Amino acid sequence: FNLISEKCDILSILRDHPENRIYRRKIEELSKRFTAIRKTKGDGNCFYRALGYSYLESLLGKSREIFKFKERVLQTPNDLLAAGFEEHKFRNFFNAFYSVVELVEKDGSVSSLLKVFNDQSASDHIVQFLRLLTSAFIRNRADFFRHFIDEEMDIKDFCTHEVEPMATECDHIQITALSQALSIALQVEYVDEMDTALNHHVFPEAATPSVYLLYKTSHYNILYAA
């Protein structure tokens, strides 16, 4: 469980980490709404790996939701080609992601899903797929995403260097692109109330996110609603 941990009670964030006790107030509030966390490896990939795992986990047993998600996934090869990705280059990453979608579709357990996401090779192929889809999404909407980058930076160069490569850290750009790309309603909770970084992924309670992530200093763990 080196890439995605077993569940820990939310208050482990305080009990195990003296360094977090300054965030006691936020964590104790979150503990009213969320019961548990899974920890993700801090390797530059944690957003993609957290969102992939958490969303597929959210689908287990929801056969209609799985069906509609499989349809979106079967369309992604065309989105990738429209963005200039050749099939022979994305095939193995598509196949890894398709495989874990079929695992969830065929009754699939949390245990079997965790095993794929803790397999370095399978998990990193899934992350690479999610990175290419993120890049494809941004490239296809250069006009929109152009607003959020460095004027001197080309959108294609941003994607080449800050989205496609493994271990490249996310900003709100990649979170927006991937969530829109797969229609994953995501909510990000912050550990640190004093962190001023604008949150583009917090909505009112009445919204129905699939995935809740817990953010601190470039790192995203998975949250479980109470």
Ligand SMILES: *CC(=O)NNC(=O)[C@H]1C[C@@H]1c1cccc(C)c1
């Ligand atoms: C989401 C994600 O993977 N976040 N990244 C981390 O937690 C990276 C920051 C930590 C790290 C890894 C290797 C080396 C250093 C100096 C930091």
